[PDB]
Coordinates of C-alpha atoms and ligand atoms in Angstrom, one line a residue:
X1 CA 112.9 81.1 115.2
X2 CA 115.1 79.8 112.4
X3 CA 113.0 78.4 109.3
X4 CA 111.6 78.3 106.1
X5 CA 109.4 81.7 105.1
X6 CA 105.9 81.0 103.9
X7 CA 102.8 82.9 103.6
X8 CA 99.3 82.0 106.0
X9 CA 96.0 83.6 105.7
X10 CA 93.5 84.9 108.3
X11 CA 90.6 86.9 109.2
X12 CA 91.2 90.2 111.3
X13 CA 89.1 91.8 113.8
X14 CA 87.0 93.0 111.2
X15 CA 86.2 90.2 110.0
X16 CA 88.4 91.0 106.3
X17 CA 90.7 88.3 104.9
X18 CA 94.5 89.1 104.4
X19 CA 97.7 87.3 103.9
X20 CA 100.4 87.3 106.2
X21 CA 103.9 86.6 106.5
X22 CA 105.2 84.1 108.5
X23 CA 108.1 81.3 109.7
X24 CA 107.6 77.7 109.4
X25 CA 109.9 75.1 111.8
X26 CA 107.5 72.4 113.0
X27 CA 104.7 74.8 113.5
X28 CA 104.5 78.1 111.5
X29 CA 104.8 81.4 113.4
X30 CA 103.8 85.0 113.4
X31 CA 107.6 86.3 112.1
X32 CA 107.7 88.5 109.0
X33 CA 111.4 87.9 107.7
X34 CA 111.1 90.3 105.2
X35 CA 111.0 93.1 106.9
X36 CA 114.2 94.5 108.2
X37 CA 115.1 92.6 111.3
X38 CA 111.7 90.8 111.1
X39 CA 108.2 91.4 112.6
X40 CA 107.5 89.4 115.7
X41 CA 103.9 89.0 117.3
X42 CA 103.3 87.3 120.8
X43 CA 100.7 85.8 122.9
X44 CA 100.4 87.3 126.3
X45 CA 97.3 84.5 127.3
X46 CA 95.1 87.0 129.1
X47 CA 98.3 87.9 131.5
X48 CA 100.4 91.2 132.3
X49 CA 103.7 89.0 131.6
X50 CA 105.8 90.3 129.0
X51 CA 106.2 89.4 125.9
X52 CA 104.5 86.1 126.2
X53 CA 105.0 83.6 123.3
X54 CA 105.9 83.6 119.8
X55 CA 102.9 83.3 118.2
X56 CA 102.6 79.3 117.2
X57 CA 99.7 78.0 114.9
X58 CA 99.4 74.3 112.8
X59 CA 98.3 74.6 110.1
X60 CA 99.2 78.9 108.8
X61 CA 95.2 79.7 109.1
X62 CA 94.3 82.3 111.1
X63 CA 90.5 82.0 111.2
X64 CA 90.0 81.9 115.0
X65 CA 88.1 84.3 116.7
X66 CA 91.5 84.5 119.3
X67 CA 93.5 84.8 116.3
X68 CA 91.9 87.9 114.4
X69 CA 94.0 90.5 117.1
X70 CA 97.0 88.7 116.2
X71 CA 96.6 88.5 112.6
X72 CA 96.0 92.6 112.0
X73 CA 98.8 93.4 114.6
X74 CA 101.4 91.1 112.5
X75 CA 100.0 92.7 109.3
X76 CA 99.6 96.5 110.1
X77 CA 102.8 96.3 111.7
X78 CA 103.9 95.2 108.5
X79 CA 101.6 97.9 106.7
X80 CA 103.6 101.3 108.7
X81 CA 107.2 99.4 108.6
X82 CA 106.5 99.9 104.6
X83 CA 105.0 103.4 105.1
X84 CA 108.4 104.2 106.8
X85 CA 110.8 103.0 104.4
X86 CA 109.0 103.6 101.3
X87 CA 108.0 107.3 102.3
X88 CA 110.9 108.4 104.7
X89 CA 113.1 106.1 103.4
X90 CA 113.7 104.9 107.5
X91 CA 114.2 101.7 108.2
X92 CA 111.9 100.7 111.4
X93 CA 111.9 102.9 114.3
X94 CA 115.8 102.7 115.2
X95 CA 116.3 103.9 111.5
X96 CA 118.8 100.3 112.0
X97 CA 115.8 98.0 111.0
X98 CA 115.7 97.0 114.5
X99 CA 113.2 93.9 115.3
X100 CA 109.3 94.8 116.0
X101 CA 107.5 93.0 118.4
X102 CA 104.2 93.2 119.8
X103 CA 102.0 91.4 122.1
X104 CA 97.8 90.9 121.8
X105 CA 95.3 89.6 124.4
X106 CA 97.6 91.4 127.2
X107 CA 94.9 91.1 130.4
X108 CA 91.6 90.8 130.2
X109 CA 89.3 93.7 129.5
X110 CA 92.0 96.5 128.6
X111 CA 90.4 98.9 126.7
X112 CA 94.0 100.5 126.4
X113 CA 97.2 99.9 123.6
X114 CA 100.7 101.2 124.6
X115 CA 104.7 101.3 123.5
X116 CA 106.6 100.6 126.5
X117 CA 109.8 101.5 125.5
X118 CA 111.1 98.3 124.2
X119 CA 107.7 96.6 122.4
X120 CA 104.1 97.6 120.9
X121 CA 100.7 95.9 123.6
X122 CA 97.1 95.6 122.7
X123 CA 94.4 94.9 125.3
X124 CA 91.2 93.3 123.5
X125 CA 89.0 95.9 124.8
X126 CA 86.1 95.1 127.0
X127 CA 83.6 94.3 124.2
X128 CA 81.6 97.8 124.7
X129 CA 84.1 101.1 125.0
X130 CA 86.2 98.7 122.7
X131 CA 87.1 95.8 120.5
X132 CA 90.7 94.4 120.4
X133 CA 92.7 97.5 119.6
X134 CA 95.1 96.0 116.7
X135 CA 91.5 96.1 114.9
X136 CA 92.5 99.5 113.6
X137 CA 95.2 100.8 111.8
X138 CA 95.6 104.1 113.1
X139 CA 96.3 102.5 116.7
X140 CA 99.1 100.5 115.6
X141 CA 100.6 103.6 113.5
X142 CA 100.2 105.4 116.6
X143 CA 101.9 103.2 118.9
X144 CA 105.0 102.6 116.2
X145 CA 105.4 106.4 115.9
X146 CA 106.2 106.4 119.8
X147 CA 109.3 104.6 119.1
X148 CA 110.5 106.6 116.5
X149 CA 110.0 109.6 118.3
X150 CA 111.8 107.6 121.6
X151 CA 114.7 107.2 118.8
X152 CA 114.7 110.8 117.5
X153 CA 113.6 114.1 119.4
X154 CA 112.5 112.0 122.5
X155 CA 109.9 114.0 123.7
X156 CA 109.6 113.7 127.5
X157 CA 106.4 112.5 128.2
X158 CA 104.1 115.5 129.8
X159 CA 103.2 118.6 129.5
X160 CA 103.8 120.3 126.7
X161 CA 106.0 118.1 125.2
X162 CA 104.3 115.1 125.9
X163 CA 101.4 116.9 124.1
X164 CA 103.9 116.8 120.9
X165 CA 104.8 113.5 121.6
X166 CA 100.9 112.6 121.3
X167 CA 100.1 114.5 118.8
X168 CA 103.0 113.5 115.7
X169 CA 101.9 109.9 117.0
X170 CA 97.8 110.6 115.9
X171 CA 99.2 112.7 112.8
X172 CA 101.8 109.9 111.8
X173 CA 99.2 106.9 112.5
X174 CA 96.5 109.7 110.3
X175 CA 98.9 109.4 107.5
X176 CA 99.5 106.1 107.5
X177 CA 95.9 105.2 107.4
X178 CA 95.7 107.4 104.0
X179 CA 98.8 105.6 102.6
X180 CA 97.3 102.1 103.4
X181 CA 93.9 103.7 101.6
X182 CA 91.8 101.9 104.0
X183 CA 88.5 103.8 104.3
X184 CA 90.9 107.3 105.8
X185 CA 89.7 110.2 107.6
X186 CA 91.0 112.7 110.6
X187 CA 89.6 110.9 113.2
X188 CA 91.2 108.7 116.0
X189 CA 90.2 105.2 116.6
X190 CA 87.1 105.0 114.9
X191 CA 87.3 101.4 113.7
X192 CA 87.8 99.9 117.0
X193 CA 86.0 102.4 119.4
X194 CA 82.2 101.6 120.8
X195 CA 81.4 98.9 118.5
X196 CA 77.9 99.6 119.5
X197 CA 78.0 103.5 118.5
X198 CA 78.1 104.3 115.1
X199 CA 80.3 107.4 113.7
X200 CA 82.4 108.2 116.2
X201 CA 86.1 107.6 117.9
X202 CA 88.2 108.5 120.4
X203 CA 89.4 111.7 119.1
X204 CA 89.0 114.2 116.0
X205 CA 91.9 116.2 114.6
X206 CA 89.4 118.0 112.0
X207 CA 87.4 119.2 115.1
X208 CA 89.0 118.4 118.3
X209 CA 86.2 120.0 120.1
X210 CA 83.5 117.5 119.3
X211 CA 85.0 115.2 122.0
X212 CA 85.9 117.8 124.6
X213 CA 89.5 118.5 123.6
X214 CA 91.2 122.0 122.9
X215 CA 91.4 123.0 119.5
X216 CA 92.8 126.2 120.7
X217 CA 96.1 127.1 123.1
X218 CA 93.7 129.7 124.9
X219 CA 91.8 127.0 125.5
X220 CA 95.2 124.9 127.0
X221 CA 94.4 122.7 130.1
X222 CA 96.7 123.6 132.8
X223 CA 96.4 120.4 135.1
X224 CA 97.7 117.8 136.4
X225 CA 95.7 115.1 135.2
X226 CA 97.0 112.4 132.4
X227 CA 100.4 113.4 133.0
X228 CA 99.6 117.2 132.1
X229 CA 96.7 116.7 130.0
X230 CA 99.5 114.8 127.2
X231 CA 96.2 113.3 125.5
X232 CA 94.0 116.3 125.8
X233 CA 96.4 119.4 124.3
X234 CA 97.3 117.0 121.8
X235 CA 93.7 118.6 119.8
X236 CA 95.5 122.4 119.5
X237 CA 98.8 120.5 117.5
X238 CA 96.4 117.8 116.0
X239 CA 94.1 121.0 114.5
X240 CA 97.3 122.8 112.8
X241 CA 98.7 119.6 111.2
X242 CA 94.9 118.8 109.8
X243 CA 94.8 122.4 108.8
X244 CA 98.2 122.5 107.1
X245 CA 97.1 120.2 105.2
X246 CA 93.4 120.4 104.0
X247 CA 93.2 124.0 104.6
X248 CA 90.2 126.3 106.2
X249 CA 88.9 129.3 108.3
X250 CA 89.3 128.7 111.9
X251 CA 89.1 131.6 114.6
X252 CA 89.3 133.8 112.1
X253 CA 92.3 133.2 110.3
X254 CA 92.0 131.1 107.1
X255 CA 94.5 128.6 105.7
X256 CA 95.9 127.5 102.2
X257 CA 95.6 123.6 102.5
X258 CA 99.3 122.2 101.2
X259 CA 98.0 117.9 101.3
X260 CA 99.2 115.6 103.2
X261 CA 102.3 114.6 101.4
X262 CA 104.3 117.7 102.4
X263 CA 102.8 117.7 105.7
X264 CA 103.9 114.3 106.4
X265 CA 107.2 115.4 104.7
X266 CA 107.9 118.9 107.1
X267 CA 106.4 117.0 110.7
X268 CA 108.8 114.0 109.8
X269 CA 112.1 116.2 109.2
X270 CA 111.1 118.8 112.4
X271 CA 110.8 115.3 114.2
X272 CA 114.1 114.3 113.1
X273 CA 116.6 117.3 112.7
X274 CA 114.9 119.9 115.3
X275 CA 113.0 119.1 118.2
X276 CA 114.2 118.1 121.6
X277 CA 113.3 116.0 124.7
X278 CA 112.1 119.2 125.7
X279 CA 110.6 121.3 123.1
X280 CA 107.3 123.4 123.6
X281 CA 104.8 124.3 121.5
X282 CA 106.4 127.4 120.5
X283 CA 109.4 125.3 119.8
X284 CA 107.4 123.0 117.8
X285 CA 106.0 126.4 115.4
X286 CA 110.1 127.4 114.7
X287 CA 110.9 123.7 113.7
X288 CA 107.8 123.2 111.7
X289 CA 108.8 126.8 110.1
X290 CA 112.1 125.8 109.2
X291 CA 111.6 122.3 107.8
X292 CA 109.3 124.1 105.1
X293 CA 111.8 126.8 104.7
X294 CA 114.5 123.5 104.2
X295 CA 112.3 121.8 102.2
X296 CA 110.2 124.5 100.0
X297 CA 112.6 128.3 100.7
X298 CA 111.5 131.0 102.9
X299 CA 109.3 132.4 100.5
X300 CA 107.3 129.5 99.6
X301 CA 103.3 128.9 100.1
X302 CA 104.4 125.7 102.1
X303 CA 105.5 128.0 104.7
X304 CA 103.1 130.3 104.7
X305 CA 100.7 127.4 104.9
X306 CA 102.5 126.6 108.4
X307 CA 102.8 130.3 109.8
X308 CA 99.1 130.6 109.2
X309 CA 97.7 127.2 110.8
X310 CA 99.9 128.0 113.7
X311 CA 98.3 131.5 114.3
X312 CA 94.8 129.9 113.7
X313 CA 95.4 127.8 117.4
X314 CA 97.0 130.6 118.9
X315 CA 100.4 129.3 119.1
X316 CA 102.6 132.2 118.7
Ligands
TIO1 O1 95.7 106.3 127.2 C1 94.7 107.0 126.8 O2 94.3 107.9 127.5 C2 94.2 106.8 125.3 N1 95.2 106.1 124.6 C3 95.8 106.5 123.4 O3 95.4 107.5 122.8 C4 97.0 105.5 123.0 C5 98.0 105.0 124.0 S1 99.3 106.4 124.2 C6 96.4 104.2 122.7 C7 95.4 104.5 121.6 C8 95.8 105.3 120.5 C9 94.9 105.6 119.5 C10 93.7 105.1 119.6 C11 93.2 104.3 120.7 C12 94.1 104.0 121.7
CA2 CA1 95.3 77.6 112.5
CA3 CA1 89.2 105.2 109.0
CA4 CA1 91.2 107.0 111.6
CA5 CA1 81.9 103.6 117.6
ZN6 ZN1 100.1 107.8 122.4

């Protein structure tokens, strides 16, 4: 669309106000132009057609109960395309400031979000294992870091590295819930999983286990299922990056806590300038190693930090 920018307001899933960025040319649309290429979010009407239509509104409200999904996944797109630049100093995924889109209200009842290699998609949940997923800003985070790892190392999807793959996009979307300083924590999901339950979420990276997942690489599943268990051994990397940075005692072996700063600063350059489509755990421990040694020299506490969290999960 080609028009004048403006700014609307609207209420998310959550029911909070916030003011987004928009294009108006007859009717005003969901397309940030200030960011990059521009942030574009779609209507997919209940269907499995993609993308579906530029979001179109009268009057730049966005008070609507079928509104509130499209509303945070315009602004929280918005919210980690900042995180990116500001922090890495990348601009969007292609590190070109290539356009974002996304799509809400894809089927009916998907209790599921995804990157599917060219766009971001949120299902609105089924109103009981989940509200709309755009709701919460680690899910979005998530989904954006799968195209910048599709752009970078380009970790195959299964297996081990699939597990990677997973597990930079729950530390990445982690981090960018601390940076947007609303309400954080270590947990997955939380904000838009089992609106009836209260404290939990999808998945933990402070304790993995509490949900069923490995928080060990003894305790590695060896299956077939979910591609090779992509969303399952993602807990043994998601424990080492949470205990990298806050520190702790786990197994045994106890950890100097660095903060999240230089964890998000060592993950994004191993991302970047050492893993492969085809990198391994193992793999994962060298390039981890070597960005602190980059970043902080060979004898610093920063690596240390890292050699020690990876020995706590048994990874090496
Ligand atoms: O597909 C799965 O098994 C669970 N999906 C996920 O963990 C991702 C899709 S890769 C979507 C999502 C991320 C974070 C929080 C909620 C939902
Ligand atoms: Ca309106
Ligand atoms: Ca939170
Ligand atoms: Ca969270
Ligand atoms: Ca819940
Ligand atoms: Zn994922």
């Amino acid at each position: 669309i080609t028009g004048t920018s403006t700014v609307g307001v609207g209420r998310g899933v959550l029911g909070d106000q916030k003011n987004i960025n928009t294009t108006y040319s007859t009717y005003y649309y969901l397309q940030d132009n200030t960011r990059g290429d521009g942030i574009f979010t779609y209507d997919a009407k209940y269907r499995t057609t993609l993308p579906g239509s530029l979001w179109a509104d009268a009057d730049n409200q966005f008070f609507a109960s079928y509104d509130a999904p499209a509303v945070d996944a315009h602004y929280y797109a918005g919210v980690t395309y900042d995180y990116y630049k500001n922090v890495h100093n990348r601009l969007s995924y292609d590190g070109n400031n290539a356009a974002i889109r996304s799509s809400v209200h894809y089927s009916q009842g998907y209790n599921n979000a995804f990157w599917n290699g060219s766009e971001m998609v949120y299902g609105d949940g089924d109103g009981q294992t989940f509200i709309p997923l755009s709701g919460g800003i680690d899910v979005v985070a998530h989904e954006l870091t799968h195209a910048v790892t599709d752009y970078t190392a380009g970790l195959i999807y299964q297996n081990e590295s699939g597990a990677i793959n997973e597990a930079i996009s729950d530390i990445f979307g982690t981090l960018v819930e601390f940076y947007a300083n609303k309400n954080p924590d270590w947990e997955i999901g939380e904000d838009v999983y089992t609106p009836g339950i209260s404290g939990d979420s999808l998945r933990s990276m402070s304790d993995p286990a509490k949900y069923g997942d490995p928080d060990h690489y003894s305790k590695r599943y060896t299956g077939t299922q979910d591609n090779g268990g992509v969303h399952i051994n993602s807990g043994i990397i998601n424990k080492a990056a949470y205990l990298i940075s806050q520190g702790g005692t786990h197994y045994g072996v106890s950890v100097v806590g660095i903060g999240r700063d230089k964890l998000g600063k060592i993950f994004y350059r191993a991302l970047t300038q050492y893993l492969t489509p085809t990198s391994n755990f193992s793999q994962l421990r060298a390039a981890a190693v070597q960005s602190a040694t980059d970043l902080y020299g060979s004898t610093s506490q920063e690596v240390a930090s890292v050699k020690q969290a990876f020995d706590a999960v048994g990874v090496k």
